[PDB]
Amino acid sequence: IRRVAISTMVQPIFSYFIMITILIHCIFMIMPATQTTYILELVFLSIYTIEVVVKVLARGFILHPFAYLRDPWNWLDFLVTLIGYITLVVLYALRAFRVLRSWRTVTIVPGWRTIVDALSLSITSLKDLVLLLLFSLSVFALIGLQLFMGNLKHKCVKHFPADGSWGNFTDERWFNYTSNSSHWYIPDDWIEYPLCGNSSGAGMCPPGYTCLQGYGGNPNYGYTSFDTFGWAFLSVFRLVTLDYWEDLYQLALRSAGPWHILFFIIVVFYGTFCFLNFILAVVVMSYTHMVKRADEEKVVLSPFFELFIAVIIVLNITFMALDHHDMNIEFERILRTGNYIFTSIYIVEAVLKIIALSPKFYFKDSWNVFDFIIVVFAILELGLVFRSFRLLRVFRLAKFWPTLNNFMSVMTKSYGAFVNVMYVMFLLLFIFAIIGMQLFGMNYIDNMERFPDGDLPRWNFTDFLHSFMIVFRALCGEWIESMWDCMLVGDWSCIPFFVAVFFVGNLVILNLLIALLLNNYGWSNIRRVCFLLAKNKYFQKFVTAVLVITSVLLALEDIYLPQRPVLVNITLYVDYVLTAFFVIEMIIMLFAVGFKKYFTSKWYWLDFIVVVAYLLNFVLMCAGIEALQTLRLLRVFRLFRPLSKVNGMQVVTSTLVEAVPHIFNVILVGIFFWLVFAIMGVQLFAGKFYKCVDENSTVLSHEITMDRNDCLHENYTWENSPMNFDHVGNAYLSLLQVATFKGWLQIMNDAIDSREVHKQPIRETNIYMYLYFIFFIVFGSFFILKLFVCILIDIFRQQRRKAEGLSATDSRTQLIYRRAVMRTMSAKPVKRIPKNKIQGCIFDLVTNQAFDISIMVLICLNMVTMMVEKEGQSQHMTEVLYWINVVFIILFTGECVLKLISLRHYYFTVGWNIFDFVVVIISIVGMFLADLIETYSPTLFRVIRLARIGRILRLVKGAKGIRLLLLALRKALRTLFNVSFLLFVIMFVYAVFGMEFFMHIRDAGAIDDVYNFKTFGQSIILLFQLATSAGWDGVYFAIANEEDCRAPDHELGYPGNCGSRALGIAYLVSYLIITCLVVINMYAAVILDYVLEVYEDSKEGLTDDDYDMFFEVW
Ligand SMILES: CN(C)[C@H]1C[C@@H](c2cccc(C(F)(F)F)c2)CC[C@@H]1Nc1cc(F)c(S(=O)(=O)Nc2ccncn2)cc1Cl
Ligand SMILES: CC(C)CCC[C@@H](C)[C@H]1CC[C@H]2[C@@H]3CC=C4C[C@@H](OC(=O)CCC(=O)O)CC[C@]4(C)[C@H]3CC[C@]12C
Ligand SMILES: *[C@@H]1O[C@H](CO)[C@@H](O)[C@H](O)[C@H]1NC(C)=O
Ligand SMILES: *[C@@H]1O[C@H](CO)[C@@H](O)[C@H](O)[C@H]1NC(C)=O
């Protein structure tokens, strides 16, 4: 018995058979359930029961160290088998989790130990981070509840009629009228009522309407609001994750006012640019430790011919990329004949190489066999669709391109880890897709009526394909809208599901892929006087002040400038003075530094271009020609000299300058892959996005209009989608939209409905086309776009090592010991004299730890009491809560006074004691000021009531891991501030240029009355939103429009209202490249470095806490 059990278990055939059974079960799970599936499930369950019995007989149940249930895998199998039998005997929410058994398949791919261990270590190490996450999220949720409570209920309500239609005015009649939903303003075809607010810069009502509060529900089926602590917490989490956050951002600013942007600036800065980087650093550290441990464990044959082949390949690539929709006969003739010529040339190539070189030698080389494969596909395709395979020819360019060759070599060197990570990703996606299908499949069908039009949405859990796709979307970073739909048709259980899918899929697996990439990819008197003036500090300070003042003056040129004659005159005279100032400065710099040195520098060249532009403007104005606004706007670029000289700024500029070439190379490689994918997409979807529409922009059913002829016969419009794959440029732009995850829903909606050309699209008639996008997203976003962060991390590490004076040849242990010595050098103790008998007793009581524990408990109680608050509460509840807060404040005051008396004047020898004292003063002052403010603006009262957060901020005191994280953040604060300042300068420059370019465009897309480029504040709001790439598709659609736009009339003075496609493309693409992919990532780099350091001080060395402990006994 025991012998038989052990012999059966040890044989690999047993494990192989179990694994094959698991794989067939997984395959059957995808297909819909039928009668045969029941018997198949029974057979699988019997097999699993045999396996469990054999293992338990071989080993034992728990009662010895090496029993059956001493292995987590055995535990998982046992629980799944028991759930199976429980469901066999008889809720239906437990049969969904049998798919967990599929996790075992991860063991097949060789090398899975490292990936699984890294995942486990990351999960274990997130313990210190989760608590800080919860605390920060709660604090931000409380702030948002205090700021935006009830603001999202604002609506435009029609004024009470004075004609007597509703009867004589009464309070009850007025309430009845205003409560009616038909009297609330809403534009036709809109789903959500627009928000309003009487604050300056907020949404304005149409004439005859008033902005009121407390009417109707909140946006997004009531799931978006700050009315209660839970909803505020959810909104703050959404903002931190940047999940469709621009919608909430715009709603908040439209309801409350532009100034509230400050709030969003904080949560984004601390939540996104810092904490998520802590998670990334933890994942990187885990993977680094595991990989380190694993490693420790242990004529024709002439250059001219090759150049000819390379040029032929490049001209074939351009011929291939020249394909587009609706080609004329001649263009197709040229492409066809060139294709024949290229194929003949390649056949000649193959025969010549086979003859000159021995066939064995020819087939020994990998590139030669690759070329032969290309030749055979070319012959097969010309003989007889095999056109797609022509794309293989493009890859032949890698042989003659050293950068691409090195990229491919690096990729193939470490394919195993990438394969393991991708397999883990797909297995997790499959498990969640199965679970979500089982949990929410029936909800969509049963409660379909709850949807706005009673129609099934595009994304749902009806079948396996849709569930897998929706989970993939959640992994990509978009989960809140799917969760909204699930709550609408489901219950609370959707929240934990989708939310979970976000943590594992996005914050761990993708971070693990980033860590993988990072590890693997990584006269004399005049001259003398002028020199003296030039190197004087006062002259430089004066120049910098003048430049800053002129930049601020530039910021005042808004849409309202023509209405202010005085401001116009100030600007004109300032420009006239600046021309002379620039000329004189150039002359002095020349006389000081010499022609060669002046013209050998890039900064002096920038100054020379600015001078030339201003002189050109001066001569144009003298001649009577209107000055070129861009040329005079060029002086903003002079601010970069003083910016680079800001203390602590050298490291950031050095990192960026050193990283420029690597960024350029990565951009070239991405352009190559995107060209390949764009050719594929053009071949797939060229000209298939046309559809038939009516007066109103709604697509007709294929039944009424079968094709183009019917559409034109019935006098309808045959319209093309703005985003399409008509030619290579449109394909590039669409792929850029897809990669950034902005506007991709519509793109793939059109793609999956695409049919033959000149045919009406049908809903989900080409579903499998999603595959084409999946691959791209895998290879375009998860790999190519993540090289920038790795490059920045490495270069910043090197530059920070350089700045501190450290040697590049030293090893990590040497640096750790050097830090330990430097810290050991500085240390001084101190003692406090105990207090007189009563004072000494009070001192002894206060010094006890139980006192601190009690204070912490009181802080927790007060924080909960703050959480109790909600929108629409009664006056009694509000007053009781305020009185409880007063009691808490008095208790804290008593504690502070007791500590002060006990410690006499030593209270101020500990920084946290000064913090407590300041918080006490602030609380006791703001508490009294609140009554006076409330008795005699609600926004001001809400803002000044923020002082309550100080007394709850004390909860961080006493922690160890949170203390370490805050230590790392404090060390990195200065570099973070410098990066933020650089980002602000870039945003200012882009704001002025955008305000110059797109100030008069007609309201469309994301541009409207509230959000536009009309003023500096609105432009800054839009650019802050765009710095994360959020909603840039709508901005592009608004600014790039060139249809139904009236041209400007110079004679009549009308400025025009028409956009510019090329200018908008350049603007937005350059901004996205500069900010999203380079400047933002810097944050991560900085964080990571500092974070890493502290841990290697805590684990492999000594920390300040160690010295404090040592001196405690001293
Ligand atoms: C409850 N009403 C009747 C009054 C009682 C007043 C009062 C009058 C006379 C005597 C006393 C006594 F006995 F206590 F001395 C107290 C003191 C204020 C209190 N109102 C209030 C209390 C708070 F806690 C907060 S708060 O939760 O926002 N806390 C904040 C706010 C801002 N800064 C930091 N903390 C806000 C407010 Cl309006
Ligand atoms: C140095 C770095 C790290 C921080 C930079 C400071 C910012 C927080 C400042 C700089 C410019 C400020 C903006 C200047 C102009 C405005 C317009 C202002 O709204 C108005 O114009 C009110 C009048 C109206 O709307 O009618 C709202 C605040 C805002 C966005 C300011 C908000 C705070 C900003 C972004
Ligand atoms: C709102 O006013 C319309 C117009 O008189 C009326 O038909 C409707 O019943 C009113 N709403 C309610 C809830 O009574
Ligand atoms: C308006 O008054 C009518 C009775 O005259 C009432 O039935 C209706 O509910 C009121 N509208 C509301 C409460 O929105």
From Swiss-Prot:
Binding site for tetrodotoxin: E478, E481, G743, G1031, D1033
Keywords: Cell membrane, Disulfide bond, Glycoprotein, Ion channel, Ion transport, Membrane, Repeat, Sodium, Sodium channel, Sodium transport, Transmembrane, Transmembrane helix, Transport, Voltage-gated channel
Region named Linker region that may regulate channel inactivation: 814-827
MF-aspect GO terms: voltage-gated monoatomic cation channel activity; voltage-gated sodium channel activity
Regulation acting on activity, per entry: Inhibited by the pore blockers saxitoxin and tetrodotoxin.
Major localisation: membrane
Coiled coil start-end: none
Tissue expression per record: Detected in adult nerve cord, muscle, gut and mushroom-shaped accessory glands.
Site, as annotated: Interacts with the spider Mu-diguetoxin-Dc1a: D323, D326, M327, R333, R390, Q683, R708, H713
A GO cellular component entry from the record: voltage-gated sodium channel complex
Binding site for saxitoxin: E246, E481, W744, D1033
Ranges facing Extracellular side: 32-37, 149-228, 254-260, 323-333, 436-463, 485-496, 557-569, 622-626, 683-728, 751-767, 994-1015, 1039-1064
UniProt record similarity statement: Belongs to the sodium channel (TC 1.A.1.10) family.
Descriptive protein name: Sodium channel protein PaFPC1
Full protein segment contained here: 129 to 1437 of 1553
